[PDB]
């Protein structure tokens, strides 16, 4: 969720 | 004779394999995606024990011939963990010839990442190394601590936490210094690095000019809009320009 490019 | 083993990202290990058929010996090399810059020396089973910076000058019957660079430019397999690097200040020599950090052209973006040189599309420009933490952790804390978090896979997030977000404190890689755009000229893409191990890199989608700022799509979840307020803002703006 809380981070780039999942 | 010689074997080359390419990673999907375009980097390779090249050398004579040993009796048991492993990338093991004193004259193995890792060759970066430009097929020129290389790290030459001692590997065991494809792990860089001692790689000295070299240029690939040519191949004869498929065999690579290197020139060492002067210095004692030695590098080592050094996967991060709480520990970002054993050499926080030693730059990636491939990255160093391609990008530099400067004030961003985007108002109040702060710093950004720029091409030193003109390159083609599909060109790997910079590396995104960091400490290796978990999604639960990342997702349990405030956005203010999540500026540099990058999803690696479904178990791992890569972070560059304060104060390593300052180049005078960390400059082994610079991928985290790339700013966000909804009209990017680059993407994050998987990369297997001889020093950092499996990380992500930053690759052009189109030809880029010397001194252009490099931008990527951060790709936060648009509808769970789980993102920091500045991104949520640029999104409203952009979707208006689109709708
Ligand atoms: N499009 C954008 N607009 C405003 N700020 C941005 C941005 N893209 C990145 N940033 C800033 O950069 C952070 C991600 S790290 C990118 C490098 C950063 N500009 C720096 O000076 O260290 C974000 O938390 C945000 O503060």
User: Rounded to 5 degrees, what angle do the CA atoms B133, B138, B144 make?
Assistant: 125
Q: Structure tokens of B65?
A: 């011939």
Domain ranges of chain B: 1-77, 78-219
Give residue for tokens 């050398």. B15
φ and ψ at residue B229, rounded to 5 degrees: -60, -35
Q: Give the integer Cα–Cα distance in Å for B19 and B16.
A: 10
Q: Give the integer Cα–Cα distance in Å for B64 and B88.
A: 30
Cis peptide before B163 (omega within 30 of 0): yes
Q: Structure tokens of A2?
A: 């809380």
Q: Give the integer Cα–Cα distance in Å for B76 and B56.
A: 19
Cβ contact, residue pair A4, B141, below 8 Å: no
Domains B1-77 and B78-219 agree in fold: no
- Chain A residue numbers with beta carbons less than 8 Å from the beta carbon of B220 are 4
CA of A1 vs chain B CAs: smallest distance (Å): 6
Q: Structure tokens of B56?
A: 């690939």
B39 within 8 A of B54, measured Cβ to Cβ? yes
B238 within 8 A of B215, measured Cβ to Cβ? no
For the stretch B152-160, contacts whose Cβ atoms lie closer than 8 Å and that sit 24 or more positions apart, written own/partner, are B152/B198, B152/B199, B152/B200, B156/B132, B157/A3, B157/B132, B157/B133, B158/B128, B158/B129, B158/B130, B158/B131, B158/B132, B158/B133, B158/B199, B158/B200, B159/B130, B159/B131, B159/B133, B160/B84, B160/B129, B160/B130, B160/B131
Question: What is the domain class of B78-219 according to CATH?
Answer: mainly beta
φ and ψ at residue B136, rounded to 5 degrees: -60, -50
Q: What is the resolution in angstroms?
A: 2.6
Q: Give the integer Cα–Cα distance in Å for B54 and B88.
A: 21
B175: left (phi over 0), alpha (psi -120 to 50) or beta: alpha
Give residue for tokens 């991928």. B175
CA of B219 vs chain A CAs: smallest distance (Å): 5
- Label residue B197 exposed, middle or buried (CB < 10 Å: 0-12, 13-18, 19+): middle
Residues 6+ apart with CB under 8 A from B206: B121, B185
Residues 6+ apart with CB under 8 A from B210: B115, B116, B117, B118
- B16 in reach of chain A (CB within 8 A): no
Question: Dihedral sign, CA of B88, B92, B93, B95?
Answer: negative
B11 within 8 A of B33, measured Cβ to Cβ? yes
B230: left (phi over 0), alpha (psi -120 to 50) or beta: alpha
Q: Structure tokens of B111?
A: 């710093």
Q: CATH assignment of B1-77, given 3.40.50.720, 3.40.50.620, 2.20.110.10, 2.40.160.40?
A: 2.20.110.10
Q: How many residues does chain A have?
A: 6
Q: Which element (helix H / strand E) includes B229?
A: helix B229-242
Please give the method by which this entry was determined. Answer: X-ray
Partners of B132 in the β-ladder: B158
Q: Give the integer Cα–Cα distance in Å for B70 and B235.
A: 48
CB neighbours (10 Å) of residue B18? 13
Out of B138, B151, B226, the one facing A5 most closely (by C-beta) is B151
Q: Give the integer Cα–Cα distance in Å for B57 and B218.
A: 37
Q: Are strands B197-204 and B186-193 parallel, antiparallel or unpaired?
A: antiparallel
Classify B68 as helix, strand or coil.
strand
Question: How far does chain B reach from its first CA to its final CA, in angstroms?
Answer: 59
Classify B5 as helix, strand or coil.
strand
């Amino acid at each position: 969720s809380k981070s780039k490019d999942r | 004779g010689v074997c080359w083993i390419y990673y999907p990202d375009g980097g390779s290990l090249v050398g004579e394999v040993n009796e048991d058929g492993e990338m093991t010996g004193e004259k193995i090399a890792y060759v970066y995606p430009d097929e020129r810059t290389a790290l030459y020396g001692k590997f065991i089973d494809g792990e860089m024990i001692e790689g000295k910076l070299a240029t690939l000058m040519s191949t004869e019957e498929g065999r690579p011939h290197f020139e060492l660079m002067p210095g004692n430019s030695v590098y080592h397999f050094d996967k991060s963990t709480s520990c970002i690097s054993t050499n926080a200040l030693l730059p990636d020599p491939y990255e160093s010839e391609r990008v530099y950090v400067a004030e961003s052209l985007i108002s109040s973006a702060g710093e950004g990442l720029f091409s030193k040189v003109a390159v083609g599309p599909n060109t790997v420009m910079s590396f995104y190394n960091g400490v290796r933490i978990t999604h639960q952790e990342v997702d349990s804390r405030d956005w203010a601590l999540n500026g540099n978090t990058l999803s690696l896979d479904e178990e791992t997030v890569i972070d560059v936490p304060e104060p390593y977000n300052h180049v005078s404190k960390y400059c082994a890689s610079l991928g985290h210094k790339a700013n966000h755009s909804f009209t990017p000229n680059c993407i994050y893409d998987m990369f297997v690095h001889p020093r950092f191990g499996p990380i992500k890199c930053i690759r052009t989608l189109r030809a880029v000019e010397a001194d252009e700022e490099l931008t990527v799509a951060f790709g936060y979840d648009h509808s769970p809009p789980e993102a920091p307020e500045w991104y949520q803002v640029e999104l409203k703006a952009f979707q208006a320009t689109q709708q």
